[PDB]
Amino acid sequence: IIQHSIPAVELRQPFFPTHMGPIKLRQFHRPPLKKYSFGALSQPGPHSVQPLLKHIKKKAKMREQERQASGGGEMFFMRTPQDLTGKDGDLILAEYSEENGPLMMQVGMATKIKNYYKRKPGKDPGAPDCKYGETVYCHTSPFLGSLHPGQLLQAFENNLFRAPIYLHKMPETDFLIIRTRQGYYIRELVDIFVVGQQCPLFEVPGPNSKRANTHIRDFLQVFIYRLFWKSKDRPRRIRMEDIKKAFPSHSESSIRKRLKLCADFKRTGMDSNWWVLKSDFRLPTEEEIRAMVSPEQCCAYYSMIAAEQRLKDAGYGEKSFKIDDEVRTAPWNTTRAFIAAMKGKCLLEVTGVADPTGCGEGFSYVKIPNKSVAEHQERYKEECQRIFDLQNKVLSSTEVLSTDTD
């Protein structure tokens, strides 16, 4: 059970962008430092980097007191955008080995760490302890390969994906800088996980699929309801211009569709007119709005449009998505293939063009039929096992390489 932060659950901006142009899609999950137009750090010259130690201790203390003040047990702390800052709480880094994994979290979403352990035969004294995560004793593997007896494997686990992770040490040279309009802050950060290839648990839709079109529609609908809720006017009213600015690729006519059932156009002598909430229309509750569209569904959709943009950039037209190698790497194909195989509907290529590492240390998620048929499945498991073990060994290794001069 995953409980996301309130800003994420509410699909607030900027945590959940309403629109992304080509540039943003290319930079998806890699935001570049952009200059500020105003505020302290818009100014030239040196700027102080501030310590956070007193602040970190204080927030931990305040949070624990709030915990004891009601009057123990479990509390949920991620209620406001302010609670999501890197400025307090314990922090880890996670570095993703896939250049563009099929699903990624937005800021404000939650994930668990699970410590998968397989018992040694006979008298097992229990799993080793880890600094992070909750131990899970598993007789069957949640991955493509099987755990060996006595093997502990850490992993990220959420509704988008499961992925093995490997704990490493941050280099002694490195610090985390947090940057706001107001100043820089610095934190020590020692724990950094390498993330291995994802096992997708959520299916990414194809471009212009019914699923995709239903999603943008519903997301637009949610944004609209939230606009009415934000309005302080009675009767509530919103401006077309504000919707168009958030959804610049929607025609005014398609926006009028979403508005015709809940609101009335009020014309004024000025090129700004209002849509006023109908007096017999009951605005959906917070709880009902949340049920309309989940953060996971937004993540699936984002994955599609970003991939679609990268494909266009590489010369692959919409008619391409009998199929080109590059199109096989698309998240709508890889997630579909992996999930089908998880349900026993087919097997996976494993060795193939969709291996995200390009060098045999990752899996190619491409459907092959279940179609000597005990040898067919034993060969699939053997190959899965080999790559599974290879990935764990390479990504957990502390060996120092050796810059490639090419």
Add this chain to the structure above:
Amino acid sequence: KLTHQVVCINNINFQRKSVVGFVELTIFPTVANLNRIKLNSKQCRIYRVRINDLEAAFIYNELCIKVPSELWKHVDELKVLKIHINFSLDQPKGGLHFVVPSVEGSMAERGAHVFSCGYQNSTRFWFPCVDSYSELCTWKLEFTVDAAMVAVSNGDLVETVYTHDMRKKTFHYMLTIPTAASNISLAIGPFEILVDPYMHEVTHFCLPQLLPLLKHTTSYLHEVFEFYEEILTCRYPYSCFKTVFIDEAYVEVAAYASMSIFSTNLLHSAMIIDETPLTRRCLAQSLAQQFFGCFISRMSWSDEWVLKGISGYIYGLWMKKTFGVNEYRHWIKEELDKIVAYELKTGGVLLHPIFGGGKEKDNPASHLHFSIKHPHTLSWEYYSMFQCKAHLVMRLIENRISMEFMLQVFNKLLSLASTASSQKFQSHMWSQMLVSTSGFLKSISNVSGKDIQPLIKQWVDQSGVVKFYGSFAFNRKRNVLELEIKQDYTSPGTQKYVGPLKVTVQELDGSFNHTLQIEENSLKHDIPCHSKSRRNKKKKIPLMNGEEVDMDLSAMDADSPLLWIRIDPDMSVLRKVEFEQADFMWQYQLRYERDVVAQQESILALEKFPTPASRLALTDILEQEQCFYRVRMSACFCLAKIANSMVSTWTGPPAMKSLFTRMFCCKSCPNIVKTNNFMSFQSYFLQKTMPVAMALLRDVHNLCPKEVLTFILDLIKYNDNRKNKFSDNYYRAEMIDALANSVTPAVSVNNEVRTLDNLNPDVRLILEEITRFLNMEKLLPSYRHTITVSCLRAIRVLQKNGHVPSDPALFKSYAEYGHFVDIRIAALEAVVDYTKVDRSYEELQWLLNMIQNDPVPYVRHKILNMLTKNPPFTKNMESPLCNEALVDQLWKLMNSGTSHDWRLRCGAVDLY
């Protein structure tokens, strides 16, 4: 305010019917310049009121004790006075029940017994105290008793020792927690113990002569107490747990099955009386009410549903956890659906709110007569709506605020501490000590959930629905199967309501799927091209994909038999459905539904709604050996209700006498069915209603009756060969309902009873089973079922004709002689079932005399309510409610709340 009393009650003198001595009341007046104080006392001899070592003016109206004011502005905020009252108890206390040696009868003449019931304003029969739920007090207790008794109060026990030599002991009991005077009690009873170790000391009291029978409730207490600690995550602070079988403990505000005096559960007997669901319910509702209720003493009596909804809910988890083989999950909806019967009632009769907030502007009290003001209006919120609709709403709010979260909620609430701390280092501790309901609201609100003010408002005020209209379509061209569900509520103050209303359509071979939602008033919902189910190939449809995709494409491409849309799974919304053509829907829910909450309701609808032949098909669910006792029962009761229709009446019947011998092997039985447990006979709920399917059919059409009589004659040949066996009570008791409505049709040529002429063959033999064995003594069975419902076999075979004055002439005698608490109530329930028929005025006079003084107080309630239920008039209205002396008795039964029974005064309240 009275904060603390130390009460010193010497003697405890049985040879006066009386307890005497001194309460020392510390009072901190929470106001300037108090001159006089109002304590409460009822019927209590006062010797002397002493303030600061002078006698002080006390005038009894409610005592007004006049404070001497011997300092300036005296008595100001938080000054502290010791009021010293010397009191003496009267013999006929309302609070108490005092039996001296000499009126105990032949079998003791030695050992007195006096026992009191505190809650709710009966403390004023013990001592002058301020008797109020607002004034919160902790007490010390010193009292001396006969040393061959052992006594119980409220407040942790800190030592029994002698009263230095000779014949009276002094117990020292000491409460730490602030609780109202409601809580206080004293019970001075027998001394014979039976203690187990291992836990916080559980120990078992009864009469000395009845100690062998206290093993199976010791060890039940072992399991019930120990288990609950883990799942509630709450230790029980009190270091011991004493369960005592008072011979005078029949209450229904005290025990009942548990009275909650401090670490001394007061129980009725019910020692080995065959529990398996019945008192496993009773003692898991009991050991719930030691947490929420006592552990965490709320400061507001207007969310008493926090007590009783949380109590009902933790009964159901523990039941289905520890006993998982009678499968509680498929029984929860009986409780669920009975509250629906009472919430389908608007317009004079007969519904109430649950959240009962006393507001100033409460303009609608026509239907709310019960406030929540004094005393008996608290007692009466254990009526079924107040329990299992609180249960219902707590089960809902779980699903919205999830279960792990409400776990962290109630586990903090039990161990969240309310301290008192002053600057000279005086550390006080209250939990086991006051807690508030305002911060309960807030705590759950913080953890989980959205708007709970609206949702809970439409459980208490003017909300809920009656009827859901169903209409159907299915269009061939599109393959779109279209549903039109309206909803409708006849009452003042009607709205549109949410109620998750699921539908699951079943293809040619009942191999489909669904979902749906419907939660607006008039909705038309569109169900996509599901010719092939979502479970297309589980093994669902390789059933129509057996060979009925193409061979019977003659009768699938004729979609005139459309996809069969079963309605309301699992009583998914608690409404009355209006859905034409429903026979297939009931069958499909009988066979293929996985939750049996649906099934038992799909065969209540098979029973009633006109259905074509399912009879051979629902014999599947007659002997599906995974199913409840009660679904196998109400599968028989389908064939019972439907009862022939036409003149194939006697074609049902062979299937009935099939399980009239339920593999009955009566060539070893009934001598090795004493030795067996009967194998429950596959639930004797189901065996009862196979000869009672026969009997209903016998009742409904009067060209049955010879062949049924033949059938049920063989059941009578099986009987009179059994001994006592625990489980087999349920067999005997619902076979006496079997044998009733056999002679009942058998002489249904009515015109009086007259004498039934000369049907010796029946009347003799049937009375032979009806009456008790007159040799057999009745001082040996501690239970009585058979002869409770064998006076009912006596009546109803002498009610369908009518032998008037034979019936009460047993039950008067049987409620005089005293022996057997059950037997007495059995008799008194049949003395009012006979007045329900009798309508000579004299019998009702003698019935409200026996209401008045009989003089068990609680059997007094029982009779009073039962006469208040069954009215003395019919349709006609000749002199309606036009009395003068009953109205005096009425006002004199009002304000007997002031004495005790808080289910008597709403007896009056209903007949006002």
Add this chain to the structure above:
Amino acid sequence: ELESQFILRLPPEYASTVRRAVQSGHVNLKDRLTIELHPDGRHGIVRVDRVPLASKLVDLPCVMESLKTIDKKTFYKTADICQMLVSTVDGDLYPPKKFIWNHGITLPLKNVRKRRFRKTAKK
């Protein structure tokens, strides 16, 4: 607006000085460590106790997340990190593709771009 986060990398001698300062929590870290970014958005100067280090803002190959936690079992994403400010002891403080970093931060992602990233096929 989303919080911006990035990695600061110092030469080891300077990193030691700064780490002790972060750990002591002293307020004067704000004077002892400052960052100046030049108008081009790629070059800058980091100052440790007034000592200027030539610095360059580089683009990391792997997406990196920072996640915060209270119980060490449930984690919340606070940011995407994709850039590093690299300070060296030599170099032009004011300099008149070279900003693409080839390695992940962690050991096994050495040479990720060249060795461990499937490359895109055009057309």
